[PDB]
Amino acid sequence: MAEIKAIINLRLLAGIAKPNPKMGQSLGPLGINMMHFCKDFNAATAHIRSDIPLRVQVAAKVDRSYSYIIKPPETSWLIKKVIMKEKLTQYAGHVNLDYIDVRYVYEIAKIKKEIDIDFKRATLESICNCIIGQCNSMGVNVSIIDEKPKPFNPKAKV
């Protein structure tokens, strides 16, 4: 019934949601129809490119009912696109080599705010300061760059 049995984080491509057996390990024992599920996902994400991986949450319930919720893509993946690298530092703080400029941070924060339910109360300084601390853990810095990057499609586990 309406009581929440469990919560799961996932990662999905927008329009290529499909009953992959590598997601039935989580949603199998809960009796949820992967086919009927993925239908309602791809329906909403038709206004989004299909290459992109998003994430979603599922409040699986006691009667094996469900209520899916969509969130922006992984914040780390978005920066690997701009940074054009796939793998980041083992260490952090000691090994600082990567560089973005602010003028894209101001643009990728809007991604989080336009979609994510948690930041509806929040301002942009708030969101921008959240990733900088996430950047400290990764080997990333925020430095002015006049140039633009060129496209890259860093991996995702899906």
Partner 1 sequence: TIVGSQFDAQTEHVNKLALDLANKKYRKMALDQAVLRKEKVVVPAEFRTEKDSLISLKKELRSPVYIKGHTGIPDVDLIADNRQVFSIRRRLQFQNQSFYFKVGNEEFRCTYDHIQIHPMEKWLVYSKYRRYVVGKPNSIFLPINILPTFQNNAIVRGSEIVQLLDGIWVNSYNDEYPHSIVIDPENLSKIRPLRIGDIHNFLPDGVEIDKTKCLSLHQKVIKITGDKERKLDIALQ
Partner 2 sequence: XXXXXXXXXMKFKREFKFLIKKKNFKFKKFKILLKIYYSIKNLINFYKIIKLNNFK
From 25-33, 45-53, 103-111, 136-144, give the range in contact with partner 2 by CB under 8 A. Answer: 136-144
Tokens of 34: 């992967």
- Kindly state whether residue 128 participates in binding partner 1, applying the rule CB under 8 A: no
Nearest-angstrom CA–CA distance, 21 and 23: 5
Answer yes or no whether residue 142 interacts with partner 2 by CB under 8 A. yes
Binding region for partner 1 (CB under 8 A) out of 11-19, 84-92, 105-113, 117-125:
117-125
Candidate residues 21, 143, 147, 150; the one interacting with partner 2 per rule CB under 8 A: 143
Q: Could you give the CA distance from residue 147 to residue 140 in angstroms, rounded to a whole number?
A: 17
Alpha-carbon dihedral sign for residues 123, 125, 131, 137: negative
Alpha carbons 141 and 18: distance in angstroms, whole number: 37
Name which position in 4, 31, 99, 123 contacts partner 2 (CB under 8 A). Answer: 99
**Contact flag: residue 134 with partner 1 (CB under 8 A):** no
Closer Cβ to partner 2, 67 or 137, answer by number: 137
Nearer to partner 2, 57 or 141 (CB): 141
**Residue number with CB closer to partner 1 (125 or 146):** 125
Let me know: does 3 contact 62? Beta carbons within 8 Å: yes
8 Å CB contact between 154 and 112 = no
Neighbours of 106 (CB within 10 A): 12
Beta bridge partners of residue 70, listed in sequence order: 56
> In the complex, which residues of this chain contact partner 1 (CB under 8 A)?
121-123, 126
> In the complex, which residues of this chain contact partner 2 (CB under 8 A)?
93, 96, 99, 136, 141-144
